[PDB]
Amino acid sequence: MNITDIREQFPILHQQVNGHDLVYLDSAATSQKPRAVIETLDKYYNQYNSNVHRGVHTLGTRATDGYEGAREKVRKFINAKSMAEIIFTKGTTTSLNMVALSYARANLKPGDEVVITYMEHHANIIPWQQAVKATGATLKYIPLQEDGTISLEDVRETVTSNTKIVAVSHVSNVLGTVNPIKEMAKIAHDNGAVIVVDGAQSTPHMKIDVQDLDCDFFALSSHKMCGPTGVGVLYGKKALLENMEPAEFGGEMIDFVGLYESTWKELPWKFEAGTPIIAGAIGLGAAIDFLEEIGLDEISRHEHKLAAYALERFRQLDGVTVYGPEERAGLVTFNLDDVHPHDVATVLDAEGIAVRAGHHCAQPLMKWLDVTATAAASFYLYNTEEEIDKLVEALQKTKEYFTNVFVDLEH
Amino acid sequence: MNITDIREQFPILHQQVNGHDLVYLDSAATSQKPRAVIETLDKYYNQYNSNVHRGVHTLGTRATDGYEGAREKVRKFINAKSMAEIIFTKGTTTSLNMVALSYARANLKPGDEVVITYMEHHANIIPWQQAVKATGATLKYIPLQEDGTISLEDVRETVTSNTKIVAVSHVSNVLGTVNPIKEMAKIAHDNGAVIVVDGAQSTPHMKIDVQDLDCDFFALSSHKMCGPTGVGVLYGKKALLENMEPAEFGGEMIDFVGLYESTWKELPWKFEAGTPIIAGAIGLGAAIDFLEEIGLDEISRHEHKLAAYALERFRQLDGVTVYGPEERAGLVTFNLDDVHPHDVATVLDAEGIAVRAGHHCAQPLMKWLDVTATAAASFYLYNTEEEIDKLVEALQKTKEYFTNVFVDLEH
Ligand SMILES: Cc1ncc(COP(=O)(O)O)c(CN)c1O
Numbered sequence: 066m067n068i069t070d071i072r073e074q075f076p077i078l079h080q081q082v083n084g085h086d087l088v089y090l091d092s093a094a095t096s097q098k099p100r101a102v103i104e105t106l107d108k109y110y111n112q113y114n115s116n117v118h119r120g121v122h123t124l125g126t127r128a129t130d131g132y133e134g135a136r137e138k139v140r141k142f143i144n145a146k147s148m149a150e151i152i153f154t155k156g157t158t159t160s161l162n163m164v165a166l167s168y169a170r171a172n173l174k175p176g177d178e179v180v181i182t183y184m185e186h187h188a189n190i191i192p193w194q195q196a197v198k199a200t201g202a203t204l205k206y207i208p209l210q211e212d213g214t215i216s217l218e219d220v221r222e223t224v225t226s227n228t229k230i231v232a233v234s235h236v237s238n239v240l241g242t243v244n245p246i247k248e249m250a251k252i253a254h255d256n257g258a259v260i261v262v263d264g265a266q267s268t269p270h271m272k273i274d275v276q277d278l279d280c281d282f283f284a285l286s287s288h289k290m291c292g293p294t295g296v297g298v299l300y301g302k303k304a305l306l307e308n309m310e311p312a313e314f315g316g317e318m319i320d321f322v323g324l325y326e327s328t329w330k331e332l333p334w335k336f337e338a339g340t341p342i343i344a345g346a347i348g349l350g351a352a353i354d355f356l357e358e359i360g361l362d363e364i365s366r367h368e369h370k371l372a373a374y375a376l377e378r379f380r381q382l383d384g385v386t387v388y389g390p391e392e393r394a395g396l397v398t399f400n401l402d403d404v405h406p407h408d409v410a411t412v413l414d415a416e417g418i419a420v421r422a423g424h425h426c427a428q429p430l431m432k433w434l435d436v437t438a439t440a441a442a443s444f445y446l447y448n449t450e451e452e453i454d455k456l457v458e459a460l461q462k463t464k465e466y467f468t469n470v471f472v473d474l475e476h
Numbered sequence: 477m478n479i480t481d482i483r484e485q486f487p488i489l490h491q492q493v494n495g496h497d498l499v500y501l502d503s504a505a506t507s508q509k510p511r512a513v514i515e516t517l518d519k520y521y522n523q524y525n526s527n528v529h530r531g532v533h534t535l536g537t538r539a540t541d542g543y544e545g546a547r548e549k550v551r552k553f554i555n556a557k558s559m560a561e562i563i564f565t566k567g568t569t570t571s572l573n574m575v576a577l578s579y580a581r582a583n584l585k586p587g588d589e590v591v592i593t594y595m596e597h598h599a600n601i602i603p604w605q606q607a608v609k610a611t612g613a614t615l616k617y618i619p620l621q622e623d624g625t626i627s628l629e630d631v632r633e634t635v636t637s638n639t640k641i642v643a644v645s646h647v648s649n650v651l652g653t654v655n656p657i658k659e660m661a662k663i664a665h666d667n668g669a670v671i672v673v674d675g676a677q678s679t680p681h682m683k684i685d686v687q688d689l690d691c692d693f694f695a696l697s698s699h700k701m702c703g704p705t706g707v708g709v710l711y712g713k714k715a716l717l718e719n720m721e722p723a724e725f726g727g728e729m730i731d732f733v734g735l736y737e738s739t740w741k742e743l744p745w746k747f748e749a750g751t752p753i754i755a756g757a758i759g760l761g762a763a764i765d766f767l768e769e770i771g772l773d774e775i776s777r778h779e780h781k782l783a784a785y786a787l788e789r790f791r792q793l794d795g796v797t798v799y800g801p802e803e804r805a806g807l808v809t810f811n812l813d814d815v816h817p818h819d820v821a822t823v824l825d826a827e828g829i830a831v832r833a834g835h836h837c838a839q840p841l842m843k844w845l846d847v848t849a850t851a852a853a854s855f856y857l858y859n860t861e862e863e864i865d866k867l868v869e870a871l872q873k874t875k876e877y878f879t880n881v882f883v884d885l886e887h
């Protein structure tokens with residue numbers, strides 16, 4: 066894995082902001098895209114754009130082959146058994162919402178439990194809150210340990226014979242914890258529940274094998290893994306998707322349409338109303354080819370290196386608190402003691418450094434950590450040790466700068 | 477309006493298919509895109525891609541300004557009063573579904589009527605069928621005249637004091653009729669109903685002024701008007717959108733999130749769950765700038781010219797039936813007597829000519845016309861009279877070719 070060679074593939078990194086080299090450490094909000102992806106989109110709009118699934122004219126055929134080819138790339142990428150299990154959506158949020166609407170809201174009665182965890186992104190909270198409100202079921206939260214991980218015992222405790230759904234993140238965007246999805250699936254299934262995995266933060270960073278994880282549903286977002294904006298995937302087990310009603314209706318997903326009643330296509334088209342996201346899906350194909358050429362295990366190893374290096378260098382700074390465990394994905398959430406995270410991020414941007422400050426779409430988790438906001442930095446396959454050095458230096462400098470102003474005003 | 481200069485802006489047109497110059501007459505399925513659009517997307521991914529709405533770092537700010545700037549371009553383009561009325565979606569289908577879910581399904585009781593027409597695209601049929609099934613309301617269809625237009629008398633007849641929604645297309649993708657939206661809005665409002673306009677086929681082709689039309693909701697698709705794939709808009713009157721619940725839930729659309737309950741953002745963000753379609757929205761901005769530079773009235777005039785020319789030349793061919801009225805948008809649906817439309821389209825493709833054959837996502841309308849399928853050709857700002865000549869010549873040749881084979885087999 067050569068990082069110089071990889072960085073040469075990302076045009077956006079070769080620029081300055083505020084007079085300094087850009088240092089992009091915001092990949093957990095959105096990743097950057099290599100030439101291969103961008104040029105895939107260009108080629109699509111310049112040469113073979115058309116509507117798909119009609120195949121009566123040449124361009125339409127090319128477009129169709131690109132689009133369904135991309136479906137097959139997604140299938141191999143997460144190791145699903147069939148393309149019928151791979152549905153293209155607007156992104157992880159929409160995917161999770163489809164499950165909550167079409168699965169939860171048709172199969173929850175009073176009595177039923179939906180169990181989430183406290184570390185969940187909002188996409189994996191609000192749909193369930195709304196499903197339980199609409200059906201008079203009840204929502205339960207699996208508690209967290211002191212280091213922000215989840216114990217399987219707490220899981221065994223929370224899920225009972227009344228649990229219909231367990232909804233959890235593979236990887237937390239805030240704590241960087243990697244949840245024990247495979248064991249949690251076995252637990253859920255023992256109690257007769259399905260598991261829905263939010264795989265937004267795992268898919269870009271590590272091999273996903275839905276047959277190994279044994280999850281029922283699994284959601285991911287293109288923009289987090291070098292892909293075009295605007296597109297995501299829902300994987301679901303063919304037997305469950307066969308029994309779910311579509312979330313949206315219109316052309317493309319129907320077979321026969323009468324005045325009053327209509328029948329649906331086979332999977333996957335049953336779940337794709339309207340002209341699909343053609344170019345974004347083909348670009349996502351391109352992103353997958355790119356990551357598979359580097360190797361997901363290689364990417365994973367790289368991320369291990371950067372995260373370990375960052376935890377060490379953060380521990381060398383006084384007055385910084387890091388949240389989450391030792392074993393983690395490639396991100397660090399943190400606060401400078403006595404400086405608000407928004408201020409940290411703005412000062413960091415004056416040095417060319419892009420990080421996130423705020424609630425990270427995890428307000429319940431913010432409350433659990435006992436804070437209003439945090440700062441967060443995330444590494445990806447284009448990041449280096451040098452970049453973490455610049456971050457720690459700028460945090461040192463920020464500490465000095467705020468203290469100096471405080472002391473100055475004190476006199 | 478110089479057509480040579482405009483065609484120089486569309487790379488995709490400069491190619492051959494099957495040894496012949498491409499002649500793209502399938503814009504009603506999807507339009508092609510000029511350099512300005514494609515280069516907008518390239519610039520986005522090459523220079524300023526980031527997540528939006530955080531504004532703590534430079535790129536994030538640029539991205540935000542691009543995205544919200546695009547919202548303002550949409551607002552000026554359809555003459556809405558406020559950006560709060562402009563919601564970005566996946567496309568027209570999703571837009572119509574949002575209205576059917578969040579408006580219809582919360583405000584229909586038994587007793588209530590939803591009136592559609594027979595000429596509707598499926599996106600504007602199936603959501604309503606499903607809303608009425610879920611709420612025990614009833615669905616009514618406004619009948620068509622002999623030439624496939626709608627009379628205001630039939631409208632006055634169909635809508636009654638029990639009608640809650642009237643759902644209709646501005647322009648039909650099959651008949652090319654332009655419906656009298658403004659008068660139909662007045663009728664609907666007299667009976668205390670809202671009107672939902674499907675503006676997928678009108679928006680690319682003519683000035684839209686939602687204040688003049690006085691519609692309540694209006695839906696359109698980027699890919700039909702030179703824009704990126706994957707993106708659309710829902711316009712709705714601010715007072716109606718203020719009282720609608722969101723269709724999907726997650727990050728970005730919340731204000732405070734508790735364990736059990738959550739509050740929503742202000743419009744428009746209330747209706748945009750998840751990372752939005754950043755690049756596609758900015759590209760759609762670019763498409764709007766492009767069409768406004770040519771002038772929508774100019775585009776409209778061009779389309780009038782091509783459609784009149786096509787109806788004349790079709791009337792010069794024996795054994796072709798054209799459907800729809802004399803006064804029409806820039807498309808012709810047709811059949812060769814005695815040749816199946818799929819065969820017509822495949823033979824046309826061997827000559828480099830792209831047209832559509834099938835049900836056109838309007839099966840009820842196909843039944844009304846008394847046919848299984850039709851062929852359809854659509855003109856746009858890159859099309860010329862020469863292209864219609866090549867189409868009519870190829871249809872003549874196709875007539876001769878099928879007749880010859882018939883006679884040959886007869887001997
Ligand atoms: C862990 C996680 N889950 C879900 C989401 C929601 O993803 P999207 O905005 O692409 O729908 C995000 C967004 N970054 C995330 O990080």
Ligand SMILES: Cc1ncc(COP(=O)(O)O)c(CN)c1O
Pocket residue numbers: 316338339340341504505567568569570597599645647648649674676677697700
């Ligand atoms: C008139 C009309 N209405 C609605 C739609 C549905 O649009 P989309 O596939 O972009 O959702 C189309 C698709 N071409 C259409 O032509």
